[PDB]
Assembly symmetry: D2
């Protein structure tokens, strides 16, 4: 399918594939099986902010999820991404549901990347339009009017759908490393609103990186976050 | 063809269509006929820089072209681009030759846009990659090997070609003005080498703004700068 | 005294000295007499936002002040600041009160300057202020901190703001504002603010200013002179 | 003296104090003995760039020193700067000479810091003017006319003096870290020309962080890089 590097906000403990007994945050290289997890304290109904950072000098792809109360989840992964992604990729946001469900409402999304050899990209979405000409949208992802990006299906009465999946990706393919680059570095941030009413909500939100032509790998609702075509 | 708002570095004095009887810089709205021109003193074989600035509050469209020596040309035009551009555009560069020719070699290209309602796009190319996936090149425009975007066709021994039109469009649509935003604005910078040993070289370089789906009007080589299909 | 170049949010109609008969916004070159005014429609007790844009190529200095409900205000002014201000200045925020009063609560302050000669550039942004802010020269009744806010005019424990107050806040470093090398010498500056009162009118307002590195509140610049000018000249 | 954290471009193999026996770059914490080092092939008279990076999330400090023909050098140190620097600091540059001598010529210097709760500071010198009011100069450091900050004393004929200490500190302080800070991260950049025909040259260039009131320690000339009061 694609080649994927992603940041998982697993709200549901899918443990026969392999997720610890609780909600967590993970680093995925080419698999739904996180190379690294951290316990996360999903705070329902509140707006949280996520930051992801990587430089190719320190080689440690990192992630932070927090809330205004202050609760913070953190994970690291030493890696030369250099070895997993192509010279050209796209950047996007992913979120799914299944049996259990939640809203997946992104209120803003800002990303930056440089190749200090410079070449650099810096886009930042603080409010989303009804028709957003610079976002490829796949799956149940749809925007506007309340100004927000809605990654997963939400009906009229503020009710999240079971078995939904959606993705939004910036229009322009992002050069992310080169042979020329002395420093291949990126950062990316998003402010989300997960709120449900189940036992535990499901399934999560992910920031992702992959090949320019990445679509949804069919049958990736629920526990696969609309990212992988199997749980291998 | 398409809608245009552009900035000409008009080198060849095509006066049976309204150019002044000399090399000039000028602001064109919807026409190869500049609403304001200024005496440019071209400096052949040298590396110059153009800045274009527009802020939607004071509504003044501005342009500067300078050489390292210290010589500068300037041209203003007050206007609510509000009435000439659509909500969504594309941005790029254009150069052309006809009977007399020149090199049209962009060394760097950068652009920023914001909607302080904030939304913002900011790209900067200090080198041009061989297969540069985030550029929509059209006509004889091609990157590569020297590090540079060759807008008009050049032969192997460095000898430029006549009757050659070239264009380079940054990949993404660019929200340029919003109903919603309090301040809509942009800036655009580029470095060039124009070299020839003709009587006057021809025809000149342009930064342009036009509707997302924009293509070179046929027969727009030379004096029309790969921007307009009539001389109206 | 100093050099001032500022933008006033002139809430009180000081007219025996030449504002007009309403809350306005003005470009002030070296005079509390604004070279250009535009009607502003004060929306008491809401957070508004100002942008102040200047490029050296266009030579037009602009101002916008708006509220959430989208109510706008615009004024511009053609000028070469090349030739008023010197090569080096300080930049800041000023407010005042008098026989009438208001909160002068700045919530965020941001400023960016460039000399496109590969550039010399300065970008700072204040989304929180702190109980100490080692990078903000604080003059007069000014105080950061505690609620998170820069407090330019005296407020008390009871939310009740004090009449006849004056304050200034300035970034700690000088700013190369224009050079003889610079093809473009350009700034922009943004702030968000909360002005609340109850008096017949409130007074007196908020201003963004540029002046010499050594600038300091002129004596008796409380009230209609915004902690900006030693005379009504 | 005060408190230091720095990145050393150690050009002289000082070994009765620790330096590995060759030109290197090192991360120094509160001691001239680098807690980390890496071999660097000093390229005489050529212009090189150093990038430094740290994010409080992944807690890894990074340095690259490279010349334009591709040759790099890398060294990394995991550390919680919570612990070593204070809420408030000054950012500055240092170099020195001793028994042996070199040109300590900085051709550009830029730094950025943020507190992503955003509070941010972003400054950059691409040309150093003669009288510069935003720099604190210390020791033998001087600027202007040629366009470059001269960290150690060079006389008229361009002959670099032996036994010279110099420092340049950016005027305003920097909030490096706070308690509210969910992320607090920085990066620096500088371009430099070290030229000499000594035996081995000396002593090297360093980027530093330290407290607002910091100044050159007495007899910190030569092998101490104008940073440390003793060789401990
Ligand atoms: N809406 C925003 N949100 C969050 N950060 C923002 C935003 N808007 C600007 N920033 C900033 C923060 C970073 O400094 C920079 C990221 O890199 P770029 O790839 O654009 O390179 C550096 C930028 O910083 C500028 N700056 C101006 N002059 C010099 C300079 N000489 N060196 C470095 N940076 C400079 C120009 C470049 O656009 O963009």
């Amino acid at each position: 399918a694609d080649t994927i590097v992603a940041v998982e906000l697993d709200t549901y403990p899918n443990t026969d594939i392999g997720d610890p007994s609780y909600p967590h945050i993970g680093i995925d290289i080419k698999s739904v099986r996180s190379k690294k997890t951290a316990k996360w304290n999903m705070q329902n109904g509140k707006v949280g902010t996520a930051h992801i950072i990587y430089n190719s000098v320190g080689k440690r792809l990192s992630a932070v999820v927090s809330y205004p109360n202050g609760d913070s989840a953190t994970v690291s992964y030493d890696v030369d991404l250099d070895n997993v992604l192509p010279e050209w990729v796209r950047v996007g946001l992913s979120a799914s549901t299944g049996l259990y469900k939640e809203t997946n409402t992104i209120l803003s999304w800002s990303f930056t990347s440089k190749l200090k050899s410079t070449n650099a990209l810096h886009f930042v979405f603080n409010q989303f339009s009804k028709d957003q000409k610079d976002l490829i949208l796949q799956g149940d992802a749809t925007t506007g009017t309340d100004g927000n990006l809605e990654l997963t299906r939400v009906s009229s009465n503020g009710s999240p759908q079971g078995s939904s999946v959606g993705r939004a990706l910036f229009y322009a393919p992002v050069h992310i490393w080169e042979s020329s680059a002395v420093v291949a570095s990126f950062d990316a941030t998003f402010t989300f609103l997960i709120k449900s009413s189940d036992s535990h909500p499901a399934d999560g939100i992910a920031f992702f990186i992959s090949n320019i032509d990445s679509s949804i790998p069919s049958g990736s609702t629920g526990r696969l976050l609309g990212l992988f075509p199997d749980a291998n």
